[PDB]
Design a protein around this ligand. Structure first.
Ligand code: NZ6
Ligand code: GDP
Ligand code: MG
Length: 167
């Protein structure tokens, strides 16, 4: 059984925890302590291959550390999450992508851009803007809602597919 180390990154409040919990416990969490950073495991079947997903839901301090570089370097694929109603969270994506490229020492790291909270009517980031950004990066873009489950399996499964292509 192949194991894939996935990491969920993005600003505070974009839905990193709710997305991870929807995949693991099949339930929408309306609150989850922003300081809890943990890894969650799930056995899935993607394209006939049984796989173990080991997902790191980043949280805690918004600060630089060499220790965090070391464990972020272990990730094989990264979900760059923003919320469709938070322009600042979209403007932060470049920052997360470049920090990941820095620790992986590569310009080619498996990533997926994720536009979360797709169920809300308060949109500030146009879908075409997110598609444009994903195209400029050469990565897939998935619209998700941790509330309704829209795109949740797609975001993680697409990331596993990106890793398979890299490997
Ligand atoms: C509200 C709590 C929450 O959900 N958080 C997510 C977050 C921001 C995450 N984070 N911030 C940094 C960072 C901070 C300052 C300078 C540079 C980076 C990182 C980070 C990343 Cl993405 C990499 C690849 C390497 C690294 N080394 N130190 C920090 C850092 C992260 C994950 C935590 C608070
Ligand atoms: N409506 C809606 N709210 C979401 C969604 N995902 C997360 N939230 C809410 O946004 C807030 C932040 O979510 P959370 O998972 O804690 O964000 P994190 O800081 O990135 O881990 C919580 O109140 C969540 O319930 C979503 O897809 N739709
Ligand atoms: Mg969280």
């Amino acid at each position: 059984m192949t194991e894939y180390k996935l990491v969920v990154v993005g600003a505070c409040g974009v839905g990193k925890s709710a997305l991870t919990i929807q995949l693991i416990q099949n339930h929408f969490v309306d609150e989850y302590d922003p300081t809890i950073e943990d890894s969650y495991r799930k056995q899935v079947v993607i394209d006939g291959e049984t796989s173990l997903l080991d997902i790191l839901d980043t949280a805690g301090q918004e600060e630089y550390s060499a220790m965090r570089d070391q464990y972020m370097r272990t990730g094989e694929g990264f979900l760059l999450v923003f919320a469709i109603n938070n322009t600042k969270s979209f403007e932060d994506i470049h920052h997360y992508r470049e920090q990941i490229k820095r620790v992986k020492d590569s310009e080619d790291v498996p990533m997926v851009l994720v536009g979360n909270k797709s169920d809300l009517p308060s949109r500030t980031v146009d879908t075409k803007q997110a598609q444009d950004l994903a195209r400029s990066y050469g990565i897939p873009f998935i619209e998700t809602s941790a509330k309704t489950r829209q795109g949740v399996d797609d975001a993680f499964y697409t990331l596993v597919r990106e890793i398979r292509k890299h490997k």
